[PDB]
Amino acid sequence: FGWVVVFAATWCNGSIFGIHNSVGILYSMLLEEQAAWVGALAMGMIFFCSPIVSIFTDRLGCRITATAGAAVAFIGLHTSSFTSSLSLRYFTYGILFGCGCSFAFQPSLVILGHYFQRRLGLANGVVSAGSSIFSMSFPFLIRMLGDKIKLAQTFQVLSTFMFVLMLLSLTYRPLLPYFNMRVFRQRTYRIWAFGIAAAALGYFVPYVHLMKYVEEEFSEIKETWVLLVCIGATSGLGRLVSGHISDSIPGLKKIYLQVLSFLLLGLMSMMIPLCRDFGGLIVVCLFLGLCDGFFITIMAPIAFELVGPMQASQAIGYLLGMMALPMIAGPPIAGLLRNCFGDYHVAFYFAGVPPIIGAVILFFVP
Ligand SMILES: N[C@@H](Cc1cc(I)c(Oc2ccc(O)c(I)c2)c(I)c1)C(=O)O
């Protein structure tokens, strides 16, 4: 019955981050029929509310919290269709759908620890790999829909994924039996969360500015899309094996194989500006995807390893809360160096440094 929960969490993570990762198409259509920050608000509200979501999880159960969050997300994403004013779309999709996604997603991570302890890394790896499949499908589905239906009906169609998520979150049967600062009482969690938050600043910069760099520098190449394939080809792969490998390494030594990611996640991050040809860029992006998958997958299992399963909910929620600010901050800062220095090179260097600082911080946790 654990794989039923794995399927439910896969649907959750995939739908939430496939609707968010495809936010450009719907709003491009809306312009065709200020606008930038509502998507950032929706994406960051998943992280900001996580400390709040942890308390509701601890009190009401993962099933109840996830079901309520998915219901709120469905309500927001559905009423976003009937809204004709942009101001109402800062609420219905911005804060309402955003908070719904946070309340739906934090229990999605927490529930996997109720069932798997020995193969928890494998379960999270499968969830992340399957979720990447959803994340690389929604961009297409909306572009099929737009050619036949308007944007409002597009929100209505996207709402049934939240409806199905609300139905599926009923499977979070709890086996294991309000501002608790007791999680911060552990120094290892503090240092680990600090390092993760530091790395998150430079984490999202490549997936935002890599396309712009390629279309600006490598103008002779028209088939740039293969790069997004390469990450998609490797990241999900990196999400699978790492999870399995996450089970082979016992205890806090697991953090080392996350540190190993960060350094490479940093190093390749400074290798895009150094690539004079295209094949080198593809090779670098392969390792970038692999390190992305490693960074994504190990996050939850290490929380259970450090703080246990009675406290993993608060640890995950607070970790996402601290992660919230750097993830939003990164790409805007990279755009600032882009505008100032005249190239993305300095942007990628400042994107690659924070992963290295995070690796240095995390190296001393074990
Ligand atoms: N999912 C998108 C964006 C994204 C990336 C990361 I790192 C996120 O933080 C996580 C992820 C898994 C965990 O177990 C924990 I604890 C925290 C989140 I929330 C979203 C991507 O593929 O990059």
CSV table of N, CA and C and ligand atoms in Angstrom, one decimal, residues 13 16-18 21 43 46-47 50 105-106 109 124 128 131-132 135 192 196 200 203-204 207 235 239 292 295-301 303 312 315-317 319-320 323 327, ligand 1:
chain,number,residue,atom,x,y,z
A,13,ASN,N,3.1,16.2,-6.5
A,13,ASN,CA,4.3,16.9,-6.8
A,13,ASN,C,4.3,17.3,-8.3
A,16,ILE,N,1.4,20.0,-9.1
A,16,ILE,CA,1.7,21.3,-8.5
A,16,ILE,C,2.8,22.0,-9.3
A,17,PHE,N,3.9,21.3,-9.6
A,17,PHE,CA,5.0,21.9,-10.2
A,17,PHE,C,5.0,21.8,-11.7
A,18,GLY,N,3.9,21.2,-12.3
A,18,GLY,CA,3.7,21.3,-13.7
A,18,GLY,C,2.8,22.5,-14.1
A,21,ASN,N,5.4,25.4,-13.3
A,21,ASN,CA,6.5,25.5,-14.3
A,21,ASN,C,6.1,25.9,-15.7
A,43,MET,N,4.6,30.6,-6.9
A,43,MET,CA,5.7,29.6,-6.7
A,43,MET,C,6.3,29.7,-5.3
A,46,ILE,N,4.3,28.4,-1.9
A,46,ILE,CA,4.4,27.0,-1.6
A,46,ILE,C,5.5,26.9,-0.5
A,47,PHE,N,6.6,27.6,-0.6
A,47,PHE,CA,7.6,27.5,0.4
A,47,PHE,C,7.4,28.4,1.7
A,50,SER,N,4.9,26.7,4.3
A,50,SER,CA,5.3,25.4,4.8
A,50,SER,C,5.5,25.3,6.3
A,105,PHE,N,1.4,20.0,-0.7
A,105,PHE,CA,2.7,19.4,-1.0
A,105,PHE,C,3.5,19.0,0.3
A,106,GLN,N,3.4,19.8,1.3
A,106,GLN,CA,4.2,19.4,2.5
A,106,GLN,C,3.8,18.0,3.0
A,109,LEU,N,5.4,15.1,1.0
A,109,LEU,CA,6.7,14.7,1.4
A,109,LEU,C,6.6,13.9,2.8
A,124,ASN,N,11.3,8.3,-2.3
A,124,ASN,CA,11.3,9.7,-2.7
A,124,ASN,C,11.9,9.9,-4.1
A,128,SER,N,10.0,11.7,-7.2
A,128,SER,CA,10.6,12.8,-7.9
A,128,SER,C,10.7,12.5,-9.4
A,131,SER,N,7.3,12.6,-10.9
A,131,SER,CA,6.9,14.0,-10.9
A,131,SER,C,7.5,14.8,-12.0
A,132,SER,N,8.8,14.6,-12.3
A,132,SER,CA,9.4,15.2,-13.5
A,132,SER,C,8.7,14.9,-14.8
A,135,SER,N,5.9,17.2,-14.9
A,135,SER,CA,6.4,18.5,-15.1
A,135,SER,C,6.8,18.8,-16.5
A,192,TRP,N,22.4,22.2,8.6
A,192,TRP,CA,22.0,21.6,7.4
A,192,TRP,C,21.0,22.5,6.7
A,196,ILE,N,21.4,24.4,3.0
A,196,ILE,CA,20.5,24.2,2.0
A,196,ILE,C,19.9,25.5,1.5
A,200,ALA,N,20.1,27.1,-2.2
A,200,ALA,CA,18.9,27.4,-3.0
A,200,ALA,C,19.0,28.8,-3.7
A,203,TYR,N,20.5,27.8,-6.8
A,203,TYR,CA,19.9,26.6,-7.4
A,203,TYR,C,19.1,26.9,-8.7
A,204,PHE,N,18.2,27.8,-8.6
A,204,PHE,CA,17.2,28.0,-9.7
A,204,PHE,C,17.7,28.9,-10.8
A,207,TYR,N,18.0,27.2,-14.5
A,207,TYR,CA,16.8,26.8,-15.2
A,207,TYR,C,15.9,28.0,-15.6
A,235,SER,N,18.1,14.6,-15.1
A,235,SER,CA,17.7,14.9,-13.8
A,235,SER,C,16.8,13.8,-13.2
A,239,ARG,N,17.5,11.6,-10.2
A,239,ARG,CA,16.5,11.4,-9.1
A,239,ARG,C,16.3,10.0,-8.7
A,292,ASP,N,21.2,18.3,-10.4
A,292,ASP,CA,19.9,18.7,-10.0
A,292,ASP,C,19.1,17.6,-9.4
A,295,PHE,N,20.3,16.8,-6.0
A,295,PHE,CA,19.9,17.8,-5.0
A,295,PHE,C,18.5,17.7,-4.6
A,296,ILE,N,17.6,17.4,-5.6
A,296,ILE,CA,16.2,17.3,-5.4
A,296,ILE,C,15.8,16.1,-4.5
A,297,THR,N,16.4,14.9,-4.8
A,297,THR,CA,15.8,13.7,-4.3
A,297,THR,C,16.2,13.5,-2.8
A,298,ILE,N,17.5,13.8,-2.4
A,298,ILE,CA,17.9,13.4,-1.1
A,298,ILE,C,17.3,14.3,0.0
A,299,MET,N,16.6,15.4,-0.4
A,299,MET,CA,16.2,16.4,0.6
A,299,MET,C,15.4,15.9,1.7
A,300,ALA,N,14.3,15.2,1.4
A,300,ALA,CA,13.4,14.6,2.4
A,300,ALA,C,14.0,13.5,3.3
A,301,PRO,N,14.7,12.5,2.7
A,301,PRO,CA,15.2,11.4,3.5
A,301,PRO,C,16.2,11.8,4.6
A,303,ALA,N,16.1,14.6,6.1
A,303,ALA,CA,15.4,15.2,7.2
A,303,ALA,C,14.9,14.1,8.2
A,312,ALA,N,9.9,15.0,11.5
A,312,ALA,CA,10.3,15.3,10.2
A,312,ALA,C,9.3,16.3,9.5
A,315,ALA,N,10.5,19.8,10.5
A,315,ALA,CA,11.8,20.0,9.9
A,315,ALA,C,11.6,20.3,8.4
A,316,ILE,N,10.8,19.6,7.7
A,316,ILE,CA,10.6,19.8,6.3
A,316,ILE,C,9.9,21.2,6.1
A,317,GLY,N,8.9,21.5,6.9
A,317,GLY,CA,8.2,22.7,6.7
A,317,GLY,C,9.1,23.9,6.9
A,319,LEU,N,12.4,24.0,6.8
A,319,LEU,CA,13.4,24.0,5.8
A,319,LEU,C,12.9,24.6,4.5
A,320,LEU,N,11.7,24.3,4.1
A,320,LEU,CA,11.1,25.0,3.0
A,320,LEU,C,10.9,26.5,3.2
A,323,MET,N,14.1,28.1,2.8
A,323,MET,CA,14.4,28.0,1.4
A,323,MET,C,13.6,29.1,0.6
A,327,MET,N,15.2,31.1,-3.2
A,327,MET,CA,14.7,30.6,-4.4
A,327,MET,C,14.1,31.7,-5.3
B,1,LIG,N1,10.2,20.7,-8.0
B,1,LIG,C1,10.8,21.7,-8.8
B,1,LIG,C2,11.1,23.0,-8.0
B,1,LIG,C3,11.4,22.7,-6.6
B,1,LIG,C4,12.7,22.4,-6.2
B,1,LIG,C5,13.0,22.1,-4.9
B,1,LIG,I1,14.9,21.7,-4.3
B,1,LIG,C6,12.0,22.1,-3.9
B,1,LIG,O1,12.3,21.8,-2.6
B,1,LIG,C7,12.2,20.5,-2.1
B,1,LIG,C8,12.0,19.5,-2.9
B,1,LIG,C9,12.0,18.2,-2.4
B,1,LIG,C10,12.1,18.0,-1.0
B,1,LIG,O2,12.1,16.7,-0.5
B,1,LIG,C11,12.3,19.1,-0.2
B,1,LIG,I2,12.5,18.8,1.9
B,1,LIG,C12,12.4,20.3,-0.7
B,1,LIG,C13,10.7,22.4,-4.3
B,1,LIG,I3,9.2,22.4,-2.9
B,1,LIG,C14,10.4,22.7,-5.6
B,1,LIG,C15,12.1,21.2,-9.4
B,1,LIG,O3,12.1,20.1,-9.9
B,1,LIG,O4,13.1,21.9,-9.3
